[PDB]
Amino acid sequence: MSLKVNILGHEFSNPFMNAAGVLCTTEEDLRRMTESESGSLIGKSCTLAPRTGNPEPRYFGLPLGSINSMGLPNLGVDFYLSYAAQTHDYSRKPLFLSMSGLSVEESVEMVKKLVPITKEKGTILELNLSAPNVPGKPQVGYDFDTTRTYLQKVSEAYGLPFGVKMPPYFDIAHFDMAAAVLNDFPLVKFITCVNSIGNGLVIDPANETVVIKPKQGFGGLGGKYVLPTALANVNAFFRRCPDKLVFGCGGVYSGEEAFLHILAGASMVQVGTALHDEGPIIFARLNKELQEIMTNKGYKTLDEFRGRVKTM
Amino acid sequence: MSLKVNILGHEFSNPFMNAAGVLCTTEEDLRRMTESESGSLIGKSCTLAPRTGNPEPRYFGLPLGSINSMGLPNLGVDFYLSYAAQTHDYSRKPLFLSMSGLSVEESVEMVKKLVPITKEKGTILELNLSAPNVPGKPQVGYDFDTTRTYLQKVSEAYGLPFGVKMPPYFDIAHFDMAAAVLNDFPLVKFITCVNSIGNGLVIDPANETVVIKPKQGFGGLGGKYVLPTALANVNAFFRRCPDKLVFGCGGVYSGEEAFLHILAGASMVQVGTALHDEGPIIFARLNKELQEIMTNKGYKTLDEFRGRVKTM
Ligand SMILES: Cc1cc2nc3c(=O)[nH]c(=O)nc-3n(C[C@H](O)[C@H](O)[C@H](O)COP(=O)(O)O)c2cc1C
Ligand SMILES: Cc1cc2nc3c(=O)[nH]c(=O)nc-3n(C[C@H](O)[C@H](O)[C@H](O)COP(=O)(O)O)c2cc1C
Ligand SMILES: O=C1C[C@@H](C(=O)O)NC(=O)N1
Ligand SMILES: O=C1C[C@@H](C(=O)O)NC(=O)N1
């Protein structure tokens, strides 16, 4: 069976890539993702200038996933642009860059720099509208006026196909409102559902203390916590945004979860917490497991079942 | 040693009660809750007229909790009012009633009927601003203008202290905005955090079909999925609304989870999915387990640690 995905003129060997933020901050990280069996990779959500991020501890692995408040530690846009222009081996796989300016002005400055490199190399933009661990910066995706402004200014500045990393929604009316904004921007060719379930709290019963230092212990949840939310968001936008692709992100630990994401509507499938836990070898495993399911069900390609989840 | 709680003018034997919607729809349900070891109980979220709710299947037990789209099945406000006025044994424990009118006009008519019964019997109101499984009805709590209207009109019609059942928030700006609205209504004396994580989607990989019938498989998540979200919401409102109580609801399966809720600021702890799984015997187990933790830590009362979660 074929795991191939054909989107934006590119051939991807399989639907798997890292979730933005995991194994993608440094040159070494990005090398390891390139050498892995993943179909693609994405750079850390970057800002105009470098950031060291939040104080420690800011990450904690959980039995059911992860909580983090990293605070967008990144080497700055120039580093990732340079990686995309000079270092990355495009013969191995295509590259995405995530950009997370803390203002529309910052985002505009950054994407303008990407234009020449997208034209030359084919580097793909994911605009992050859901960074939940920066003190004093609300998630853009939870204000539809602000979301409209970002999409307007970035569409105009970048002028090329791009995608958006969205926060999870939990209300039908929000799925509708979000889709209505997204559908006004034709250059938005993909939607990544979802970012962390924002601002959860984990407390250690032994010492009666929170497990992360920033924001009084409040951090984004990933892993097993997020699968049903992720599947819901993937399916909601798959149906509401037929002119666009949907990328799935959340709760993928196995080919089974990957299969469910694709059944829900996903084109690419991103792996965060599970990759942080296991390392890039996970991609070899995911390919094997997804192949096995497709073999068992007699699916020859992903296109035979993408978005074909059955309702009652 | 004592699990006792003194709030809203009552002594509660212990902090435990059912989550609204679980073991509280029929007279038989309410009898079993009253006979249980629970410190209190709350009636099913009711409407002006009876409802039978959504078609089957509308509930599905999961390894990590539950998904439901019940659709507010209830015997109508008159039934729960008559239970409160005539049937309930107040010498056993205090009674809460949840009310979830599908419009502000419906809510007003309902709470007006409760006034004489609160005055006579001491019945407590929990206004549901987070009912996520009624098609065409957005969650009131995710619209702060609508929330303000409900609180204004109910404050006016009811005119006595009451509480609110809130949806989970995932963004610091939303915690701020929610608290700003709540803090404008002095009659709001408690905040229950949280209702289900709304509009999750569960898919069976074997038959490639959603597991519940209503809303294309979309339903509220309960159980292990929601504990970090619940703790965060409890603590966020505990800090932002110092003139109000907070009740904890989400992911309680054991004395340990109860302990964490109370540490975060919970006065009362509600049990949903776990109670559905185990039946009312769980309250005897929870009392024993909580006391065990307190014994090990050398605490004699809940007041020794309620709201005393430590940050770094
Ligand atoms: C350590 C860590 C760092 C992350 N950094 C980013 C980031 O820079 N940009 C982003 O859009 N999402 C970031 N995320 C969120 C993930 O991309 C992903 O949306 C989320 O973890 C859910 O996927 P999962 O269930 O596979 O973990 C980060 C998550 C983790 C755990
Ligand atoms: C079968 C079922 C019915 C529910 N009905 C109601 C309801 O009528 N009103 C309400 O406010 N919450 C209702 N809920 C939500 C619960 O009160 C609770 O907030 C949620 O399940 C999270 O708690 P848990 O993790 O202990 O399940 C219901 C949940 C379930 C599972
Ligand atoms: O988009 C983001 C940003 C990242 C961080 O905190 O750096 N962590 C997240 O969970 N999501
Ligand atoms: O508040 C509510 C309503 C209930 C239902 O659907 O009846 N189910 C829920 O999960 N929460």
Annotated domain spans of chain A = 5-53+72-196+224-304
Ligand 1 closest atom vs CA A224: 25
Q: Please, what CATH class does the domain formed by B5-304 belong to?
A: alpha beta
Tell me the C-alpha distance between A55 and A46, whole Å: 18
CB B33 within 8 A of CB B18: yes
Q: What is the CA(A197)–ligand 3 centre distance, in A?
A: 10
Of B92, B7, B85, B101, nearest in space to B41 by CA: B92
Give yes or no for residue B70 CB within 6 A of ligand 4: yes
Pick the CATH number of A5-53+72-196+224-304 from 3.10.110.10, 3.40.50.300, 3.20.20.70, 3.40.50.720: 3.20.20.70
CB contact under 8 A, B205 and A260: yes
Give yes or no for residue A44 CB within 6 A of ligand 1: yes
Q: Which residues of A touch B237 (CB under 8 A)?
A: none
- Tell me the two tokens of residue A90: 């495009």
- Residues facing A223 on adjacent strands: A65
Question: C-alpha angle A66/A255/A15, rounded to 5°?
Answer: 90
CB contact under 8 A, A172 and B231: no
Distances (CA, A) of B91 to A24, B85, B198: 62, 13, 36
Give yes or no for residue B71 CB within 6 A of ligand 4: yes
Tell me the C-alpha distance between A287 and B170, whole Å: 33
CB pairs under 8 A between A and B: 164
DSSP annotation of B6: E
Give yes or no for residue A59 CB within 6 A of ligand 1: yes
Tell me the C-alpha distance between A277 and A274, whole Å: 5
Of B145, B180, B151, nearest in space to B164 by CA: B151
Helix and strand tally (H, E) in chain A?
9, 16
CB contact under 8 A, B203 and A64: no
Helix (H) or strand (E) holding A170: none
Tell me the C-alpha distance between B223 and B160, whole Å: 32
CB contact under 8 A, A209 and B311: yes
Q: What is the CA(A196)–ligand 1 centre distance, in A?
A: 6
CB B218 within 8 A of CB B240: no
| Other residues' Cβ atoms within 10 Å of the Cβ of residue B312 | 13
Experimental structure resolution, Å: 1.9
Give yes or no for residue B195 CB within 6 A of ligand 2: yes
CB contact under 8 A, B229 and A235: no
Of A218, A228, A194, nearest in space to B236 by CA: A218
Tell me the C-alpha distance between A265 and B208, whole Å: 12
Mutation to test the A interface, candidates B56, B143, B146, B199, most A Cβ within 10 Å: B199
